[PDB]
Short mmCIF file of C-alpha atoms and ligand atoms in Angstrom, two decimals:
data_model
loop_
_atom_site.label_atom_id
_atom_site.label_comp_id
_atom_site.label_asym_id
_atom_site.label_seq_id
_atom_site.Cartn_x
_atom_site.Cartn_y
_atom_site.Cartn_z
CA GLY R 1 0.24 14.13 8.91
CA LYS R 2 0.17 12.72 12.42
CA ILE R 3 0.59 9.08 13.43
CA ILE R 4 0.73 7.61 16.93
CA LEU R 5 2.53 4.29 17.48
CA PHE R 6 1.72 2.16 20.53
CA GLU R 7 3.74 -0.51 22.33
CA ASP R 8 0.70 -2.66 23.16
CA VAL R 9 -2.47 -3.70 21.35
CA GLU R 10 -5.65 -1.67 21.85
CA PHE R 11 -3.62 1.56 22.15
CA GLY R 12 -2.00 0.61 25.43
CA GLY R 13 1.52 0.97 26.72
CA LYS R 14 4.16 3.43 25.58
CA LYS R 15 3.27 5.74 22.71
CA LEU R 16 5.21 7.72 20.11
CA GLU R 17 3.55 10.52 18.14
CA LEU R 18 5.18 11.37 14.81
CA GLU R 19 4.58 14.14 12.27
CA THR R 20 7.56 13.37 10.01
CA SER R 21 9.11 10.28 8.44
CA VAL R 22 11.49 8.20 10.56
CA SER R 23 13.92 5.87 8.77
CA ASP R 24 15.00 4.08 11.96
CA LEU R 25 12.57 3.75 14.88
CA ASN R 26 15.53 2.85 17.15
CA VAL R 27 16.34 6.57 17.38
CA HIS R 28 13.17 6.84 19.52
CA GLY R 29 13.40 3.39 21.17
CA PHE R 30 10.44 2.12 19.14
CA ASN R 31 12.03 -0.50 16.91
CA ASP R 32 10.26 -3.85 16.89
CA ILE R 33 7.74 -3.10 19.62
CA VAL R 34 4.69 -1.60 17.91
CA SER R 35 1.44 -3.51 18.39
CA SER R 36 -1.25 -0.87 17.62
CA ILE R 37 -1.49 2.42 15.71
CA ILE R 38 -3.70 5.48 15.45
CA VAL R 39 -3.46 7.62 12.32
CA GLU R 40 -4.88 11.03 13.25
CA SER R 41 -4.22 12.61 9.84
CA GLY R 42 -2.39 11.88 6.62
CA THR R 43 -1.70 8.66 4.76
CA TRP R 44 1.30 6.71 6.13
CA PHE R 45 3.36 3.76 5.03
CA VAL R 46 4.87 1.69 7.80
CA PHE R 47 7.70 -0.75 7.11
CA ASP R 48 9.16 -3.83 8.83
CA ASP R 49 12.76 -2.93 7.85
CA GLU R 50 14.65 0.28 8.52
CA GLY R 51 15.01 2.80 5.71
CA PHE R 52 11.50 2.58 4.29
CA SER R 53 12.10 -0.96 3.12
CA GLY R 54 10.99 -4.51 3.89
CA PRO R 55 7.29 -5.45 4.15
CA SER R 56 5.20 -2.24 3.84
CA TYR R 57 1.66 -1.34 4.91
CA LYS R 58 -0.56 1.58 3.92
CA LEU R 59 -2.53 3.29 6.67
CA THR R 60 -5.11 6.04 6.34
CA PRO R 61 -6.76 8.02 9.15
CA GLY R 62 -8.33 5.74 11.77
CA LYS R 63 -7.52 3.29 14.51
CA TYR R 64 -5.61 0.02 14.10
CA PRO R 65 -5.96 -1.91 17.38
CA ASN R 66 -3.63 -4.81 16.45
CA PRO R 67 -1.11 -5.64 13.71
CA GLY R 68 -3.67 -7.81 11.85
CA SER R 69 -5.71 -4.66 11.33
CA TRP R 70 -2.95 -3.35 9.01
CA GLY R 71 -2.11 -6.83 7.63
CA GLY R 72 1.21 -6.92 9.49
CA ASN R 73 3.21 -8.68 12.19
CA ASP R 74 3.53 -7.83 15.89
CA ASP R 75 6.71 -6.18 17.13
CA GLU R 76 8.17 -5.62 13.63
CA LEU R 77 7.77 -2.00 12.54
CA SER R 78 11.16 -0.34 12.02
CA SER R 79 10.47 2.77 9.90
CA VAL R 80 7.51 5.01 8.93
CA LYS R 81 7.00 7.38 5.98
CA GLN R 82 4.37 10.01 5.20
CA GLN R 83 2.56 9.75 1.84
CA1 CA T 1 4.43 -4.74 21.43
CA1 CA T 2 11.54 -4.64 12.02
#
């Protein structure tokens, strides 16, 4: 699986590419800043709390240009897990 997290909407700003689960996005300086997402491959769950907990959102391959596109809130993702 490969997911790319973006600081700004419409795939702008700083980006973080991940191929493994991350229980705490702070380790990569990406806690509570994500505003768009591209899933290149795999199914991913993204969570608003650390540790694969809090509000969760399922994402399959494709582009998600704003948090509404995954049903979520801006600047709230804290952990991500591969399905
Ligand atoms: Ca942001
Ligand atoms: Ca959060």
